[PDB]
PDB file of C-alpha atoms in Angstrom:
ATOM      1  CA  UNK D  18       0.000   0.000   0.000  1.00 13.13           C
ATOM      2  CA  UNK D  19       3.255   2.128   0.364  1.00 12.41           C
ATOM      3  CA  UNK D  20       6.763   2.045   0.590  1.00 10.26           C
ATOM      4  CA  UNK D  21       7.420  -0.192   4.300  1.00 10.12           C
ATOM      5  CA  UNK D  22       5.297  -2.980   2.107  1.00 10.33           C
ATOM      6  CA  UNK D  23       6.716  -2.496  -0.879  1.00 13.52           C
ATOM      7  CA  UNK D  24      10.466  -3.020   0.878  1.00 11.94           C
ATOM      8  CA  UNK D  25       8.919  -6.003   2.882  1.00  9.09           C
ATOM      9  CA  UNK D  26       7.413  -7.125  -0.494  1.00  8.43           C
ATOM     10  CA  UNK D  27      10.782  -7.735  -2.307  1.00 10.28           C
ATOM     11  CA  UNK D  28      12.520  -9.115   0.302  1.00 10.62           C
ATOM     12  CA  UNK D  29       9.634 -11.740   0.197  1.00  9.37           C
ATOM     13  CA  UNK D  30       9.689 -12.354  -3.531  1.00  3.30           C
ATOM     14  CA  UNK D  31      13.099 -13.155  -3.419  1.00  2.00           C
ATOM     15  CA  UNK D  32      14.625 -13.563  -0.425  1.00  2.00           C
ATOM     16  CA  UNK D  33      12.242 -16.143   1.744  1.00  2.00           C
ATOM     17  CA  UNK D  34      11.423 -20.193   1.103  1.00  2.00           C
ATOM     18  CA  UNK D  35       8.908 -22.127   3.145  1.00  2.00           C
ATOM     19  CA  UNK D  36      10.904 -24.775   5.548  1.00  2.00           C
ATOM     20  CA  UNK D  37       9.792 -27.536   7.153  1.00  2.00           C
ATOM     21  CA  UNK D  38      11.163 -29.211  10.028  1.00  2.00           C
ATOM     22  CA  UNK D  39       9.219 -31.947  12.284  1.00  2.00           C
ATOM     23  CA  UNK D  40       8.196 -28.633  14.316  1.00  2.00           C
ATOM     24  CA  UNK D  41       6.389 -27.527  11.268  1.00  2.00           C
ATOM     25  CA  UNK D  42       6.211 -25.543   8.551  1.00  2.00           C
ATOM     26  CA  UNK D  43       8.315 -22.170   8.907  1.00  2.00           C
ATOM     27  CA  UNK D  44       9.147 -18.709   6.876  1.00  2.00           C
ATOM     28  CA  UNK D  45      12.749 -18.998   6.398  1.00  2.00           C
ATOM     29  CA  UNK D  46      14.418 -15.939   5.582  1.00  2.00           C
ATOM     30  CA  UNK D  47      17.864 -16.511   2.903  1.00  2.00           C
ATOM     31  CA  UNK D  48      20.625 -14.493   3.342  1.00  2.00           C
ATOM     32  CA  UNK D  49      23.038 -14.861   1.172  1.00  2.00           C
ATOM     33  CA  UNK D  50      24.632 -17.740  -1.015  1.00  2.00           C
ATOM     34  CA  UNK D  51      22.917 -20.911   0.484  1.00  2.00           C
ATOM     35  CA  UNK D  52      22.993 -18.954   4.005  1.00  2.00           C
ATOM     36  CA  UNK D  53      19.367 -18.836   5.336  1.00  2.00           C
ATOM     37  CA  UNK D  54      17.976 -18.253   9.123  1.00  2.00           C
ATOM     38  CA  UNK D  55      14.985 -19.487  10.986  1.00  2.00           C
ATOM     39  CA  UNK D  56      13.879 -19.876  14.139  1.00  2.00           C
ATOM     40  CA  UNK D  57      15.949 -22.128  16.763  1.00  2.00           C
ATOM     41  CA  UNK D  58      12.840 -24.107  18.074  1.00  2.00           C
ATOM     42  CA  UNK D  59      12.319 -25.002  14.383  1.00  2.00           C
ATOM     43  CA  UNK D  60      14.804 -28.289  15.455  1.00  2.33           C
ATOM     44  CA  UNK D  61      16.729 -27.882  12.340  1.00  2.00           C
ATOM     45  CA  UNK D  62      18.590 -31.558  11.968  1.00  2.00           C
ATOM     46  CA  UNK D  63      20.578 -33.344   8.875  1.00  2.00           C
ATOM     47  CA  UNK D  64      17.690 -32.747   6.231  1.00  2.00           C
ATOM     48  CA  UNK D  65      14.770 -30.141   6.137  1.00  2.39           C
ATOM     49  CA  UNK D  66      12.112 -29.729   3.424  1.00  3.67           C
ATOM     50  CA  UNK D  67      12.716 -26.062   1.257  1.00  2.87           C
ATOM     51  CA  UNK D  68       9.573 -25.596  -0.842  1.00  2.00           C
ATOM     52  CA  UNK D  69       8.592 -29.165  -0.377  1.00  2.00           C
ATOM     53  CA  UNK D  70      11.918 -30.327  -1.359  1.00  2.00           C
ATOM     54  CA  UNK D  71      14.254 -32.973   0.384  1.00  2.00           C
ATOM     55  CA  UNK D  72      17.010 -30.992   0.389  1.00  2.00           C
ATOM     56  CA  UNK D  73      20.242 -32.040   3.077  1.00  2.00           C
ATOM     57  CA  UNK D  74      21.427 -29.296   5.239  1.00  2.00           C
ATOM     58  CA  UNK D  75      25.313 -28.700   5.420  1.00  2.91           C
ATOM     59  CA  UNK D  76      25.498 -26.712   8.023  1.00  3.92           C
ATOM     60  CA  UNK D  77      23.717 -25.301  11.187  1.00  5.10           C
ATOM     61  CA  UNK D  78      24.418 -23.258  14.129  1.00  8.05           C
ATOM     62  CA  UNK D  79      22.043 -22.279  17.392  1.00 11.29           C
ATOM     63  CA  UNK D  80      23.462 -18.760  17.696  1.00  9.87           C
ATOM     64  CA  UNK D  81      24.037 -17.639  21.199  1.00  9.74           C
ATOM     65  CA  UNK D  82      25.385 -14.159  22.887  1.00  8.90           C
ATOM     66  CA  UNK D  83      28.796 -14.550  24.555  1.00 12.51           C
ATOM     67  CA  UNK D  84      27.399 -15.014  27.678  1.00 12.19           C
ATOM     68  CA  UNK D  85      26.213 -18.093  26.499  1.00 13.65           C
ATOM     69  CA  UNK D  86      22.442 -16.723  26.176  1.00 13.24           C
ATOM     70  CA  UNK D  87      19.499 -17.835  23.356  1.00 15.70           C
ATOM     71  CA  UNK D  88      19.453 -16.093  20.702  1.00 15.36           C
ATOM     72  CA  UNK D  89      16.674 -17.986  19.384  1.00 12.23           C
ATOM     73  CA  UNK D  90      18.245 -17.146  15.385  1.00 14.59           C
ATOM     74  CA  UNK D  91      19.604 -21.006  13.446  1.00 14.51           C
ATOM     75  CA  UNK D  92      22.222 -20.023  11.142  1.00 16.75           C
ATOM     76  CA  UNK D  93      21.256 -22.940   8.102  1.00 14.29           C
ATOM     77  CA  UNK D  94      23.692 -23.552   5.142  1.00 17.24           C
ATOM     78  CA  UNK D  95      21.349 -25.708   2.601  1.00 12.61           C
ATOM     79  CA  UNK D  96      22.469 -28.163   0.151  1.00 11.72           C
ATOM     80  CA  UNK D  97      20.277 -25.972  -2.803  1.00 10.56           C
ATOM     81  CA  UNK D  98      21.644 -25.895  -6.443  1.00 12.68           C
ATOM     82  CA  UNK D  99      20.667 -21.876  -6.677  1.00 15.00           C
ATOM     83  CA  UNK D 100      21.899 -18.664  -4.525  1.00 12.66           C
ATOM     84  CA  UNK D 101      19.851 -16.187  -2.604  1.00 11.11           C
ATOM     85  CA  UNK D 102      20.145 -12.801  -3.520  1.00 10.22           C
ATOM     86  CA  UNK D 103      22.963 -11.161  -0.936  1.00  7.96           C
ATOM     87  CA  UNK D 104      21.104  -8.945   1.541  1.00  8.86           C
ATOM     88  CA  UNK D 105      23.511  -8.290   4.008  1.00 11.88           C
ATOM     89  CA  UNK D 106      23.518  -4.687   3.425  1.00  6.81           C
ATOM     90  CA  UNK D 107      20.227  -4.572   4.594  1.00  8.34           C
ATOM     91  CA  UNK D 108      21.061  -6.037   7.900  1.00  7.41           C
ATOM     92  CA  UNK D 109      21.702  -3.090  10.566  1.00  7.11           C
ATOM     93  CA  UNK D 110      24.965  -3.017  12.113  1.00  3.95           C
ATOM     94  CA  UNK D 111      23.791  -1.959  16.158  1.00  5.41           C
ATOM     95  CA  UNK D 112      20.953  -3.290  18.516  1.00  8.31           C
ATOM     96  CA  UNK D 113      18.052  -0.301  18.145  1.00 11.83           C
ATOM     97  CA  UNK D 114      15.205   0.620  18.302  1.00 12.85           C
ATOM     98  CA  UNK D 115      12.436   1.128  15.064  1.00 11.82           C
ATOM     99  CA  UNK D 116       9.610   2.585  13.701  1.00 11.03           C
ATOM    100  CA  UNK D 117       6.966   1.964  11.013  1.00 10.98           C
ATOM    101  CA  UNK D 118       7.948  -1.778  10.767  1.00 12.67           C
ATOM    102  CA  UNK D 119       5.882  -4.766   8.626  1.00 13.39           C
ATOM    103  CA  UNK D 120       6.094  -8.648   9.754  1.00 14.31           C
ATOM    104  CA  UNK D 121       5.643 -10.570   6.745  1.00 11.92           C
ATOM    105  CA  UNK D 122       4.723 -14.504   6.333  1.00 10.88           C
ATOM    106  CA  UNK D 123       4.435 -16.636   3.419  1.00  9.97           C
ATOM    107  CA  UNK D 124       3.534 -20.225   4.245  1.00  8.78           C
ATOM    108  CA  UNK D 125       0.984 -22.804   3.561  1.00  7.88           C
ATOM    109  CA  UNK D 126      -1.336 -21.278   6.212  1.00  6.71           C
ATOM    110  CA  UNK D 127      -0.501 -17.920   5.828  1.00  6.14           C
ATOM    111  CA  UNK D 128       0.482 -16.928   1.858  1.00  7.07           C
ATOM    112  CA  UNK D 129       1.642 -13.407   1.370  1.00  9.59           C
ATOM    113  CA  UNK D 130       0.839 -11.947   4.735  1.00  9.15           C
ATOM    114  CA  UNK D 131       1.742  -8.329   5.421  1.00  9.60           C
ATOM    115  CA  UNK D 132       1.187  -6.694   9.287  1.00 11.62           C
ATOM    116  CA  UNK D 133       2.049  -3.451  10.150  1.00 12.56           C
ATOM    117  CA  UNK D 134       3.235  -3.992  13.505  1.00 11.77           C
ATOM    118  CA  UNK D 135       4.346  -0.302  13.750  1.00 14.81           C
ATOM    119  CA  UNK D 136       6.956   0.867  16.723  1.00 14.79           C
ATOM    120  CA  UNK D 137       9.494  -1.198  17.784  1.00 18.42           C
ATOM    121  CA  UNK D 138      11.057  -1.293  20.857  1.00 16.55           C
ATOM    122  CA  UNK D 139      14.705  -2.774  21.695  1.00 17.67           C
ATOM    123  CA  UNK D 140      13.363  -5.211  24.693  1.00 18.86           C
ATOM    124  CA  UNK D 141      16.290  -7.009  25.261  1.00 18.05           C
ATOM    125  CA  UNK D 142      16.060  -9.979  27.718  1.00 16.53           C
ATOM    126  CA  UNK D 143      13.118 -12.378  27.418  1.00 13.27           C
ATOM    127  CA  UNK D 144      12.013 -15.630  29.220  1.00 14.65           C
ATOM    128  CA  UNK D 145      10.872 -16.912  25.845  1.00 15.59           C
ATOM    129  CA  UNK D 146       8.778 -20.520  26.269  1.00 16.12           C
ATOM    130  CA  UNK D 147      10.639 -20.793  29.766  1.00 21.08           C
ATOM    131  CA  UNK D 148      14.369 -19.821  28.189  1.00 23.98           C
ATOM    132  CA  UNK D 149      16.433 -16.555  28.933  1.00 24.00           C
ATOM    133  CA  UNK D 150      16.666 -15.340  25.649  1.00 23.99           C
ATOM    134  CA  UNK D 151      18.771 -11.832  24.296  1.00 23.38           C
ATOM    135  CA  UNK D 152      18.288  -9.411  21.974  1.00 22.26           C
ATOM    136  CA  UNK D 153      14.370  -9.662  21.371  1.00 22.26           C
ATOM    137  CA  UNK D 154      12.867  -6.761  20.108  1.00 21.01           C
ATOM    138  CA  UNK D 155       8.865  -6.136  20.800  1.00 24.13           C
ATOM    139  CA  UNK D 156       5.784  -4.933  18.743  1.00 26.15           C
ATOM    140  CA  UNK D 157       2.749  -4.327  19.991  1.00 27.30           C
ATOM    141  CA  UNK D 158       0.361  -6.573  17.636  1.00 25.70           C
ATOM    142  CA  UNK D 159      -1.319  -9.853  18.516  1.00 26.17           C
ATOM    143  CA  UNK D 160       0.549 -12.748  16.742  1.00 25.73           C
ATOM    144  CA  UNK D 161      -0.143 -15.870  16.537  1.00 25.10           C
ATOM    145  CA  UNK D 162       1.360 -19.685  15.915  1.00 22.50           C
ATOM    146  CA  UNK D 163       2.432 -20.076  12.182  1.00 22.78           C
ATOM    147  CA  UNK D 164       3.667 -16.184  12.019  1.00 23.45           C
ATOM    148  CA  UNK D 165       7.098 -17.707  13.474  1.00 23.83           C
ATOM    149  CA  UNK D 166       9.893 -16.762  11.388  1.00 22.08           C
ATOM    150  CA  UNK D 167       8.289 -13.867   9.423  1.00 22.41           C
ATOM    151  CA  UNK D 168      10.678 -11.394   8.604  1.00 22.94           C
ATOM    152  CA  UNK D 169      10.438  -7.844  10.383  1.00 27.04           C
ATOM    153  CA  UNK D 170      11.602  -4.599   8.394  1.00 29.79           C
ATOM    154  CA  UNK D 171      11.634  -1.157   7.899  1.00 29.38           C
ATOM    155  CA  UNK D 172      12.362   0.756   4.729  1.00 30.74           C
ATOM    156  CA  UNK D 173      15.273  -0.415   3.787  1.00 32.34           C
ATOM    157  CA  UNK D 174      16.645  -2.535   6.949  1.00 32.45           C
ATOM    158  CA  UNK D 175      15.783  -6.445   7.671  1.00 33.32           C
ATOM    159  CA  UNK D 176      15.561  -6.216  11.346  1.00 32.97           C
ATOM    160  CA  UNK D 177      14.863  -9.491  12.678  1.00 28.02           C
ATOM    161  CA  UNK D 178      12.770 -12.920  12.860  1.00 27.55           C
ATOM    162  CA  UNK D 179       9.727 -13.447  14.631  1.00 29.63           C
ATOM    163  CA  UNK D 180       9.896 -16.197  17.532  1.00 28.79           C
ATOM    164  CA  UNK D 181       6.782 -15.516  19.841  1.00 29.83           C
ATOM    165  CA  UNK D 182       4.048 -13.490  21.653  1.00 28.23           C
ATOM    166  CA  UNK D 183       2.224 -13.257  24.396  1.00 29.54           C
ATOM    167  CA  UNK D 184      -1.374 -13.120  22.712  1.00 30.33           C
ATOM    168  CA  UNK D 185      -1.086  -8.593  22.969  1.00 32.23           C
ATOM    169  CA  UNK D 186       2.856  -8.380  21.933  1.00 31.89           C
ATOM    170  CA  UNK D 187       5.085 -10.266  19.426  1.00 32.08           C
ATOM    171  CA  UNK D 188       8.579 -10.712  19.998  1.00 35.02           C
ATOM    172  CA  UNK D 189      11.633 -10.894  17.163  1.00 35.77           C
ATOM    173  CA  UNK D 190      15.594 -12.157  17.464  1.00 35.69           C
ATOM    174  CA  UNK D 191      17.589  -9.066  15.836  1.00 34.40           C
ATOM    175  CA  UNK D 192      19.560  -9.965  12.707  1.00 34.25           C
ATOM    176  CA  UNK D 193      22.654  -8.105  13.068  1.00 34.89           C
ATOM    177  CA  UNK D 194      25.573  -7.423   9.911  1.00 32.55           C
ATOM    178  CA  UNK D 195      28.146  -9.081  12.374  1.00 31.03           C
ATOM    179  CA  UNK D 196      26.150 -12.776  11.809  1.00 30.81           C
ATOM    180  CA  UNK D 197      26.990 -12.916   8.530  1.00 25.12           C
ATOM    181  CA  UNK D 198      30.356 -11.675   7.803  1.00 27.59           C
ATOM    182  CA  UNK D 199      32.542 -14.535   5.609  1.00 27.09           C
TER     183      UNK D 199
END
């Protein structure tokens, strides 16, 4: 309807497959080469399904803080015979704060979902499904279960991943440059 969806509606076109792990079926945001993230309680394990493909996975990492804190973000490296688009310079550099941001979905249960979640506020710490969890930022919008991994932006920055609500706010795991330097 204006420019915050049409930003969040080209990183979708290009930039997102639909995983699934025994957890379910998850947005999965791609990076860069065959780099993608998704959720950490998505279970990642030796093969995942990319747009109902078998497809082995060659690589994945649980990201956590260095005081050995949840993240919540799986770095995934997928055995796929095509490239992502690089992003990266799209990824902010600094934890902050936002405003005007759109979570976007695109799975079975939810194809091409836009939200306008609004203001964003740098939370921090979160007890997330019982586990101390850093870095969360928080919208005020009532998600719900199949929304994880949507991908939050702004125009012109991919913020984050969501991972959970509360049933009145949503919560996201910030993607930072620093991730996804080679």
């Amino acid at each position: 309807m204006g420019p915050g969806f049409d930003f969040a509606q080209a990183i979708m076109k290009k930039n997102t497959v639909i995983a699934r792990t025994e957890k379910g079926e998850f947005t999965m945001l791609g990076v860069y080469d065959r780099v993608a993230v998704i959720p950490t309680h998505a279970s990642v394990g030796e093969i995942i399904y990319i747009n109902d493909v078998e497809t082995r996975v060659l690589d994945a990492c649980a990201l956590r803080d260095l005081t050995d804190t949840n993240l919540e973000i799986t770095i995934v490296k997928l055995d796929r015979n095509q490239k992502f688009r690089d992003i990266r310079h799209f990824l902010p550099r600094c934890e902050d704060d936002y405003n005007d941001a759109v979570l976007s979905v695109h799975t079975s249960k939810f194809p091409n979902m836009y939200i306008p979640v609004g203001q964003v506020t740098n939370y921090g710490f979160l007890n997330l499904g019982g586990t101390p969890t850093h870095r969360i930022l928080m919208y005020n919008f009532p998600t719900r279960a199949g929304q994880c991994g949507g991908v939050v932006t702004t125009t012109g920055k991919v913020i984050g991943i969501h991972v959970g609500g509360n049933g009145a706010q949503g919560f996201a795991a910030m993607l930072l440059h620093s991730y996804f330097t080679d």
